[PDB]
């Protein structure tokens, strides 16, 4: 298929014939921006090269940027980009330590319940319409929840909260309650860190106020946690909606992997894994270097950034045999780089693998037999994160 | 003594140890006994400073400002800017966008109503026979032309140095931040379709988090952070700071009371004296040698403006005394090069009224030296407390 | 349940959990929340374990033998042992001397002064109805032997185990170790004319120490602490961790009391049930791959000795229960490979004796399982305390 | 001169020709032990070479061991080795934070007058005898007293301290009353460890204990603050003899550049600086490479071992001009690699420093003229640290 090239939400169907491209042809895929040339960058695209990268913190950094533009950390051109920027260790290690400390096993078990409750309630009423948008319905709505819980927002404020939330994921003048929102979320959070000096919990944000981050007059720190929420607010957010959506297709496409897991429900777990290796929500980030590096016959130049295409990774035959590009429930892939590997590995990938399983084994128990019209799919735009829209779903059982 | 980053206590009088520097170690490396590997050097000549500051490609800003490699742990205790620029091509569209926000009529418009102010207080003040000039007008004075520079309605600019003063400041400072955070949301919101002159409006009106963008709307949030911050403050520090230096010496004050059309001469001077930003660090981006010394690429390299500015191998002997008729040149209060200060104009424009004034309506006052009190931060030197009085 | 490093309160049952990753997760992968670049591998099938014993050029032991790569941080809590093996060429010539030490002669030698004190125990035990097996027991007997081996004269072994069971037990134990560590100094010169067949005496007859070497004669001391606790705890922890067994299954016993003539084969399956040393990490020195599984160079690979001694796929069904007259073949309660145990001749010594004692003279005991005590520790295994009792 | 060899007593006094050989013809010395070739290692000598190379503790690894000795972590070879293994950052920062409590500027202050005291009595008494052996009179007994004091030695010890000293110093049957030394050594220190329990001073081995190293039975910790007191105990002593020893025959060879610190004394600390880069102590140590990293044209294979020829560094004409080789106590030079750079750059350098401005300042003084002897000079054996046995001086003026 065609050269590298930035996704977008016309691309974004398909865009596994370009990583093969990459992965069979190169490598390390050198991009030069025809009219802006000192902006030049490397795509990485074969499992072990981006596998490597992604865990050698110290030659390929994070605090620089995570997408492959330049102007990052800067104002302008940002929009698809992580509302914070991440360091390396032993920098961000303080960091990880203190918000793994809310990222526990019981964080998850103490949310499942709520997971699905909700998948059960929206999953029936569909069956109710005998179908509709199950990213509209359910898929898009249901990580909110998760995502409020793991920030330590008090169920009275869910309702509030995921309102402001909705109206920003929505971003992409429509987008004016967003700016709304963003502000409205913004004055929340300040307040709940306050709530928290004195009356905190076991969740993420307790143990950076309980540590001390944005205290006695410390604006920076106050104004990183903020950066924080927003960017589980919005990727937290979405990444599992890719997952989840994006499955839909994948599912739909075979019937024989669905029979599987339906004639034995144990398979469920497993297949989370698969549909985490094929789906890959955070198709690819970006690394700079910290020094001229050589892979193959290539030599990025240092301070070069370098995108870690983790979705073209995941897909790769080298590591996954030749089958890589299908859908195989019992394949129990190792070494997936849907959550990274190294320094910043997901803390969440438990509460994501979470919510996948509920929702799948739910679906699989309720509408056995649903129907996706994949052609009337819509995609969100960025080229970082790969969700869908609109999942024209469908059971094709009714009542 | 050896050289160390200032505190509260250490920042009465640093120009011994800046003399000494600049004398004996020009190029002095710092190397932490807990963390050797977080070591830095310290630039502390006008030439040196000066080549520093005007060379981005070697002497990056990217990295940090802070000679703390460790700066953005959120650990706690973090000062240093509340964002970070980038360095050209990067910052040059940014800057160019920003700096139609700082134009001559951005700074001609706002200084009548700069002027009245200072007036106003500066008689509260003869009404009292002092107070404390920097709370009662310098901490004050500085907020306002941040706002008008960021946009801000007259209305709201009393309830905006509501919180100004609050986080420039028990954390109820806290609440502030957000209050203000929703507020510049709305702000931009607006400026949408209201494009007015102000930095905000050229930067939105390009398309800066106008589109629920999220990190764009928090940059954008972060940069007028800086300035609400970083803009008082140093203001506050230059104004506060020139207050023992004209007291100190009467024969000066004299020379501007008798005439006062060398008062613009003198800002220059006091600038000179006071650089309010001491210092910011850059960051090597390769090898490079300055004199007998070779700085490793990657090094926090901290120049040293507050320094440079006392180079007696620039302005002369007397480089270390007040002298409003010097007129001194290539001064690098607002620094040199791709990073230069767009505030300049706004700030000369703010102490050119507030001296006048000060001297015009009290040209005998009083400085408790010994009762000041600086605030903490080691790269940049501000007055907390500056008792006044007039008699 | 999941995999996690034991505790001694985890200890009385591992066999669920390991049974789980062989049949489920041969090649466990462990991502630490806080530390996801301390991450590690856990290879719990017998195939495995042996492969990867067999290979050091793949699988190192110089890195450390745990999965903490922070593991040589003072801080605290170090779970390792004093001191840690190369591997060959570098280790060839070190095991090679030590050896020596480790001789068929060196054995059978010692034997009767070690079934001599197990029977007087067992008898100063049968005269109280019973007792803690334990310290009565089976803690003091090992030391003996270590002490053999390590050349410690006859006379000495009151006073030093005086410090063994200090050290391996409120700190008076740094007296012990000073005690001890200055003993060895004077041993060790003692040596230097007067060379024994202790492993110390081949030691320093080859050069080590001798000569005011320092390191050279720390590293003596190193190996001596190894062997002086890790020696005690692991046949402690066998004859210790055999009472439960024995007690379990009576009719197990009763077979040894008809015909003591199986209990050297029994000696066997004691031992691939203990695995008083449950497990033992290396490091990849290249990418290696097993299984669908690939593991990075550089990353620790926890070797369970004790879940692949108890691996169905190698020792049938009833793999998990006591057969004393199974026999086993290949087991790997000494490790297989360039560090095979020295002592495990030394080891099972100690059981065939101690165990044939037991049985002769106390044929009908009973162990209160509900209240044995386990020592701390992820790596080795070992009760602190059996209760035991003749009747 | 000759192709790379490790130094021997015989060797120590002119190896500047072998590392100009090295420098100018090979940067990265490839050395294969001609019977045991799976032993190769690498030497590095040119200034920016070894510079890159201590700063880049990543690539770089100490936790290997720091001499070329493969057997180093085992217990065959040795002899030749620091008591104790140094570890990498991040595992080595919590080490380095707690020692360097113990190395402050008072610590320096604290025992300088101690120093002079001692300098100015033997000074005098070889002003007696008009000359002796200022390395056995002076240089050898003086580092002593400094690292008793860093270790927290009380005073009354001091006397039996320094004895065991002695007699470990000089191991290289003579070296019997050093396994005796070491064992006396050894249990004083587990009791020292046992006072500081509860009566902590300021000294490096407080911090340690006070930090809980080696508290309740962890015998491993206690174990490594012995070795640190060990590898003190030995090289923190005679690496300031080498200087202090070294620095004779330097001084007399150029009776113009003492003059010029006696007609100034201010010129001193800046001689100290001077003499330090030319007697380079720590001639050289040893580190293993943690991924294949290429210098030049050679790449050098991960795990193997390369030495850093700081000895030869601080002599590099690159680096210093065309009078590298030369004494100017007027140079200030900067960027000496006697003490290092980077994660472990000496924790002692400002009381090595102290020391040799206090000897020199009072030598100079009262010896204005003195004359050294040369071709009678002894060198210690070890091929890591080059320090003097004997220094047969003789001030010509006596009483
Ligand atoms: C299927 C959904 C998800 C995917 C694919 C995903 C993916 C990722 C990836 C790849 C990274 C590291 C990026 C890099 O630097 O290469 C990351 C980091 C992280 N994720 Fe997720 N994530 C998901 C869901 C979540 C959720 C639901 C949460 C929160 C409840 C979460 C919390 C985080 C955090 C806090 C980190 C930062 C860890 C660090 O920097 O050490 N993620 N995620
Ligand atoms: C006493 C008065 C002030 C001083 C001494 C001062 C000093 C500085 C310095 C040293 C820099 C460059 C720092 C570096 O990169 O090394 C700077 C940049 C800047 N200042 Fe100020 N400043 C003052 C007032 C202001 C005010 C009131 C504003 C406007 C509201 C302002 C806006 C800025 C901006 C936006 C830049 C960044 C320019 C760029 O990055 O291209 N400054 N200032
Ligand atoms: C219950 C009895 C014992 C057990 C289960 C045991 C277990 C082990 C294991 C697993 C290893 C190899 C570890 C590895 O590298 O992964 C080992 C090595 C060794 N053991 Fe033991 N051991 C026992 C008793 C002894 C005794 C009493 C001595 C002798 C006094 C001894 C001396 C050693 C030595 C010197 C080696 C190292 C060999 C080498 O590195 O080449 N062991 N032991
Ligand atoms: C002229 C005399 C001295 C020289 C040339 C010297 C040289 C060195 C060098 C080169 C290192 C680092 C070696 C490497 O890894 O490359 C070192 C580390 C150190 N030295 Fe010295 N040293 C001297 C005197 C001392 C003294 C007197 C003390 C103690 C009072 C001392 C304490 C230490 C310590 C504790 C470190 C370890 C720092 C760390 O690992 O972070 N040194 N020394
Ligand atoms: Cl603290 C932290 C920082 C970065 C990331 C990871 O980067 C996130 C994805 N994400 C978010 C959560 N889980 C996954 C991201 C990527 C690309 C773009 Cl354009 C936007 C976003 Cl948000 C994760 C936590
Ligand atoms: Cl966009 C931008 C970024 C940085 C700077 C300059 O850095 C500011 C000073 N400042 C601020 C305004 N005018 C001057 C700063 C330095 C040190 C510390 Cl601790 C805090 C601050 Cl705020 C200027 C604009
Ligand atoms: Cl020279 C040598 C080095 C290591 C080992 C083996 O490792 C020992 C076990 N051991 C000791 C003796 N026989 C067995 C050990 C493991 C874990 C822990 Cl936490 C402590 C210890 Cl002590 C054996 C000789
Ligand atoms: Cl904690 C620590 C570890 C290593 C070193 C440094 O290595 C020391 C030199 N030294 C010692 C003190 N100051 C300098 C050394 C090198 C070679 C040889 Cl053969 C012996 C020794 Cl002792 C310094 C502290
Ligand atoms: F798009
Ligand atoms: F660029
Ligand atoms: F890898
Ligand atoms: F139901
Ligand atoms: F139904
Ligand atoms: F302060
Ligand atoms: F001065
Ligand atoms: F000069
Ligand atoms: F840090
Ligand atoms: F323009
Ligand atoms: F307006
Ligand atoms: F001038
Ligand atoms: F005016
Ligand atoms: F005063
Ligand atoms: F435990
Ligand atoms: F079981
Ligand atoms: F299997
Ligand atoms: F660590
Ligand atoms: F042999
Ligand atoms: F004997
Ligand atoms: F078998
Ligand atoms: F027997
Ligand atoms: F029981
Ligand atoms: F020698
Ligand atoms: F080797
Ligand atoms: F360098
Ligand atoms: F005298
Ligand atoms: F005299």
Same mark, same amino acid.
């Given at each position: 298929?065609?050269?590298?090239?930035?996704?977008?939400?016309?691309?974004?169907?398909?865009?596994?014939?370009?990583?093969?491209?990459?992965?069979?042809?190169? #490598?390390?895929?050198?991009?030069?921006?025809?009219?802006?040339?000192?902006?030049?960058?490397?795509?990485?695209?074969?499992?072990?090269?981006?596998?490597?990268?992604?865990?050698?913190?110290?030659? $390929?950094? /994070?605090?620089?940027?995570?997408?492959?533009?330049?102007?990052?950390?800067?104002?302008?051109?940002?929009?698809?980009?992580?509302?914070?920027?991440?360091?390396?260790?032993?920098?961000?290690?303080?960091?990880?330590?203190?918000?793994?400390?809310?990222?526990?096993?019981?964080?998850?078990?103490?949310?499942?319940?709520?997971?699905?409750? $909700?998948?059960?309630?929206?999953?029936?009423?569909?069956?109710?319409?005998?179908?509709?948008?199950?990213?509209?319905?359910?898929?898009?709505?249901?990580? +909110?929840?998760?995502?409020?819980?793991?920030?330590?927002?008090?169920?009275?404020?869910?309702?509030?909260?995921?309102?402001?939330?909705?109206?920003?994921?929505? !971003?992409?003048?429509?987008?004016?309650?967003?700016?709304?929102?963003?502000?409205?979320?913004?004055?929340?959070?300040?307040?709940?860190?306050?709530?928290?000096?004195?009356?905190?919990?076991?969740?993420?944000?307790?143990?950076?106020? !309980?540590?001390?981050?944005?205290?006695?007059?410390?604006?920076?720190?106050?104004?990183?946690?903020?950066? $924080?929420?927003?960017?589980?607010?919005?990727?937290?957010?979405?990444?599992?909606?890719?997952?989840?959506?994006? /499955?839909?297709?994948?599912?739909? =496409?075979? #019937?024989?992997?669905?029979?599987?897991?339906?004639?034995?429900?144990?398979?469920?777990?497993?297949?989370?894994?698969?549909?985490? =290796? @094929?789906?890959?929500?955070?198709?690819?980030? !970006?690394?700079?270097?910290?020094?001229?590096?050589?892979?193959?016959?290539?030599?990025?130049?240092?301070?070069?950034?370098?995108?870690? @295409?983790?979705?073209?990774?995941?897909?790769?035959?080298?590591?996954?045999?030749?089958?890589?590009?299908?859908?195989?429930?019992?394949?129990?892939?190792?070494?997936? @780089?849907?959550? +990274?590997?190294?320094?910043?590995?997901?803390?969440?990938?438990?509460?994501?693998?979470?919510?996948?399983?509920?929702?799948?084994?739910?679906? @699989?128990?309720?509408?056995?037999?649903?129907?996706?019209?994949? +052609?009337?799919?819509?995609?969100?735009?960025? +080229?970082?994160?790969?969700?869908?829209?609109?999942?024209?779903?469908?059971?094709?059982?009714?009542?």
């Amino acid at each position: 298929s065609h050269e590298f090239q930035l996704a977008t939400a016309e691309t974004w169907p398909n865009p596994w014939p370009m990583y093969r491209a990459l992965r069979d042809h190169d #490598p390390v895929h050198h991009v030069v921006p025809p009219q802006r040339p000192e902006y030049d960058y490397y795509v990485l695209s074969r499992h072990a090269d981006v596998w490597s990268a992604a865990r050698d913190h110290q030659t $390929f950094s /994070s605090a620089q940027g995570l997408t492959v533009n330049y102007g990052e950390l800067e104002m302008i051109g940002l929009h698809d980009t992580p509302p914070m920027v991440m360091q390396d260790p032993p920098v961000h290690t303080e960091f990880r330590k203190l918000v793994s400390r809310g990222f526990t096993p019981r964080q998850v078990e103490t949310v499942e319940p709520t997971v699905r409750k $909700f998948v059960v309630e929206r999953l029936e009423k569909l069956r109710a319409n005998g179908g509709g948008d199950i990213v509209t319905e359910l898929f898009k709505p249901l990580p +909110s929840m998760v995502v409020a819980h793991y920030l330590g927002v008090p169920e009275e404020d869910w309702t509030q909260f995921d309102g402001w939330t909705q109206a920003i994921v929505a !971003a992409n003048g429509a987008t004016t309650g967003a700016l709304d929102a963003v502000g409205s979320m913004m004055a929340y959070f300040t307040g709940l860190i306050e709530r928290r000096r004195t009356e905190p919990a076991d969740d993420a944000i307790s143990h950076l106020v !309980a540590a001390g981050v944005g205290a006695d007059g410390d604006t920076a720190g106050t104004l990183s946690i903020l950066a $924080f929420t927003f960017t589980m607010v919005t990727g937290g957010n979405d990444t599992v909606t890719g997952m989840l959506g994006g /499955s839909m297709p994948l599912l739909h =496409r075979r #019937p024989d992997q669905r029979r599987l897991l339906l004639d034995d429900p144990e398979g469920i777990p497993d297949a989370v894994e698969e549909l985490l =290796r @094929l789906t890959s929500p955070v198709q690819g980030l !970006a690394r700079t270097t910290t020094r001229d590096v050589t892979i193959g016959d290539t030599t990025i130049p240092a301070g070069r950034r370098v995108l870690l @295409l983790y979705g073209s990774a995941n897909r790769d035959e080298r590591q996954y045999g030749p089958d890589a590009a299908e859908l195989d429930v019992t394949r129990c892939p190792r070494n997936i @780089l849907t959550f +990274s590997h190294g320094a910043h590995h997901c803390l969440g990938a438990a509460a994501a693998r979470m919510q996948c399983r509920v929702a799948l084994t739910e679906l @699989l128990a309720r509408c056995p037999d649903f129907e996706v019209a994949e +052609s009337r799919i819509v995609w969100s735009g960025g +080229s970082y994160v790969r969700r869908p829209l609109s999942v024209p779903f469908r059971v094709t059982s009714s009542r």
